[PDB]
């Protein structure tokens, strides 16, 4: 059973979603390589010495391709516009999807012609990202 990983267009990142029992993480869709990128970060968070003290906040730092947590949020933290929601149960997803806005849109996850300059400007062309995440521990 895979993580409910779906992109969302039109986001309303507010106060709310977090400290109310959000047992399900969401990143910024503008700098997520593909659905693979996440699928990697979740596997990396799942099988490496916990760099973050909760699994859901680790996905953020792994996908960030950087050790630091505060700087990780600086580059891949979810923001107004478009996001990549991760959940476990279909209606636990619905709760957060209700709080933020917009349509479920998996096409905002994938790399435009636009990302492959900006994505690798801030990562220093789509699998190279995974190897930054892979070396996160050297």
């Amino acid at each position: 059973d895979p993580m409910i990983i779906r992109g969302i267009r039109g986001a309303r990142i507010n106060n709310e979603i977090f400290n109310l029992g959000l047992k399900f993480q969401i990143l910024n869709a503008d700098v997520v390589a593909t659905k693979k990128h996440v699928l990697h970060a979740i596997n990396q968070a799942k099988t490496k010495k916990p760099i973050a003290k909760s699994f859901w906040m680790e996905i953020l730092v792994r996908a960030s391709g950087q050790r630091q947590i505060h700087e990780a949020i600086k580059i891949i933290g979810a923001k107004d516009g478009n996001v990549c929601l991760i959940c476990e149960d279909e209606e636990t997803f619905r709760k957060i999807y209700e709080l933020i806005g917009g349509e479920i849109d998996d096409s905002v996850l994938e790399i435009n012609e636009d990302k492959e300059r900006l994505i690798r400007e801030i990562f220093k062309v789509v699998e190279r990202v995974l190897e930054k995440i892979a070396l996160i521990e050297l």
């Binding site: 699928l39 990697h40 995974l130 892979a134």
Partner: protein, 495 residues
């Protein structure tokens, strides 16, 4: 008919006379001092003629092979006198091969990959393709030299060897020391200074001694394993002065024990560079002057690892490099390197992309198990494809020039380190840190040159040029390190 031989390449003065069948009649050896040879020879050659009648000997042999300049010409003097004052033929023999032959003659060995480790020199020799060829080789100083030099630094007695083996047996802590592999060759003078400083640092002498061997002999048995495949012999012989070393004997066995190959060591008196040693070879050759660097590979004979698993990760067919642990080496050091190299095969095969040079994508690094997940690029080794597609030699030269521009220095450059799907992906980088030093760059070049000369001597010429064709293209300071490559190549024996 039976023959007498004279040994005088280094420090031991050896007179010895052997039969055409294979029995030693006389074998005594007394230990810049060419005078030592010029004064010992008459004494020993007297004691020889007091054991065997002069008339009945038919051949004069003298180790004209690898050795010191004045030491050789003294032996050559005594040899040239004997041959005409007896009216018996002279035969100039190669010193290294002489060690191999009385190994075969004493041990129940027949075609062995021999590790010739002595105070004077250290290298791996096995007869391949009508000549005796050297594979593994010290790039600086012999294991004997390197070990002895450390002893003298600590002010231990003049056969240092034994006492360093003694104190080693009482060590408990494996000190961190520079393990150094340059492709198939070794360097020791690094490890020597390291131990030299470790001693000044405060570490237990008992300790420093243990790890010194642990690093020396582990990197010795390491290259021997490397040869064990390329030469594919069923037997591993150990000649040379330092063949005494119980520990080196221990791990050398251990190693050959895995690949089920046999391991012999010549009975004590025939490892030390000796008279009878070279005396046998001359008459063996039966059935002209000095050459201080007798390049063994130039004789006429007339007596004729870590496993991969293919797997699929996400949406890719990949491989996983399990750095299999070796039982022969110290438990602390064993897992210490296979972590250490995994941490660089990852760090480099990745960093390599940063200056546009193909290598597999690494999806996972697992230092706990010493395994690494990298994309399976379909194997077509540059080695196998270099004949018909000579064009491949171009990019290999190119992508090395990228590295030398960025101070990234691989240390194991070989044609089997590259494959072909469309470009030339390096499927290996295990050992090779970053170094600004100009001599480094030059050393890595000759490492590959020797590698092509090793396995591709059949079509080497006009392809070390095809290497440069790419290497000249990329790196600008190319004439800078190749000119210095001449300076480090002139590290031959002292003409």
């Amino acid at each position: 008919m039976i023959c007498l031989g004279l040994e005088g390449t280094a420090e031991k003065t050896g007179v010895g006379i052997v039969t055409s069948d294979g029995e030693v009649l006389f074998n005594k050896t007394i230990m810049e001092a060419a005078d030592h040879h010029a004064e010992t020879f008459p004494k020993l050659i007297k004691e020889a003629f007091e054991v065997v009648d002069k008339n009945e000997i038919d051949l004069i042999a003298f180790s004209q092979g690898p050795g010191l300049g004045p030491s050789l010409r003294v032996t050559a003097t005594v040899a040239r006198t004997l041959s005409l004052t007896l009216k018996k033929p002279i035969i100039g023999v190669n010193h290294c091969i002489a060690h191999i032959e009385i190994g075969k003659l004493t041990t129940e060995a027949e075609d062995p990959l021999t590790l010739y480790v002595s105070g004077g020199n250290t290298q791996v020799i096995a007869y391949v393709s009508k000549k005796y060829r050297v594979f593994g080789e010290t790039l600086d100083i012999a294991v004997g030299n390197c070990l002895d030099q450390f002893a003298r630094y600590v002010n231990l007695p003049h056969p240092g060897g034994p006492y360093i083996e003694e104190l080693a047996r009482k060590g408990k802590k494996l000190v961190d020391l520079p393990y150094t592999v340059k492709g198939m060759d070794i360097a020791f003078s690094g490890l020597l200074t390291a131990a030299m400083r470790a001693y000044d640092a405060g570490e237990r002498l008992e300790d420093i001694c243990y790890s010194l061997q642990e690093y020396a002999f582990s990197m010795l048995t390491e290259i021997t394993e490397r040869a064990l495949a390329h030469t594919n012999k069923g037997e591993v012989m150990l000649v040379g002065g330092v063949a005494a070393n119980n520990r080196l004997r221990e791990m050398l066995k251990a190693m050959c024990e895995g690949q089920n190959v046999d391991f012999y060591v010549p009975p004590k008196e025939f490892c030390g560079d000796n008279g009878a040693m070279i005396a046998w070879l001359g008459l063996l050759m039966h059935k002209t002057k000095i050459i201080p660097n007798y390049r063994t590979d130039m004789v006429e004979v007339n007596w004729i690892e870590a496993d991969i698993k293919r797997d699929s990760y996400l949406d890719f067919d990949v491989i996983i490099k399990e750095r299999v642990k070796k039982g022969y080496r110290d438990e602390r050091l064993d897992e210490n390197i296979r972590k250490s190299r995994t941490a660089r095969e990852a760090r480099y095969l990745a960093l390599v992309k940063d200056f546009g040079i193909p290598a597999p994508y690494i999806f996972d690094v697992d230092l706990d198990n010493k395994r690494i997940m990298m994309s399976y690029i379909n194997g077509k080794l540059a080695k196998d494809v270099i004949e018909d597609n000579l064009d491949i030699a171009y990019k290999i030269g190119e992508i090395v020039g990228k590295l030398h521009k960025n101070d990234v220095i691989h240390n194991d450059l070989t044609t089997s380190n590259f494959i072909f799907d469309k470009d030339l992906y390096i499927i290996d980088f295990g050992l090779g840190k970053i170094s600004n030093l100009d001599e480094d760059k030059a050393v890595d070049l000759i490492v590959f040159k020797k590698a092509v000369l090793s396995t591709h001597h059949e079509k080497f010429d006009e392809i070390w040029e095809r290497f440069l064709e790419g290497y000249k293209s990329v790196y600008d300071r190319w004439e800078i390190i190749l000119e210095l490559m001449k300076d480090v190549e002139r590290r031959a024996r002292y003409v």
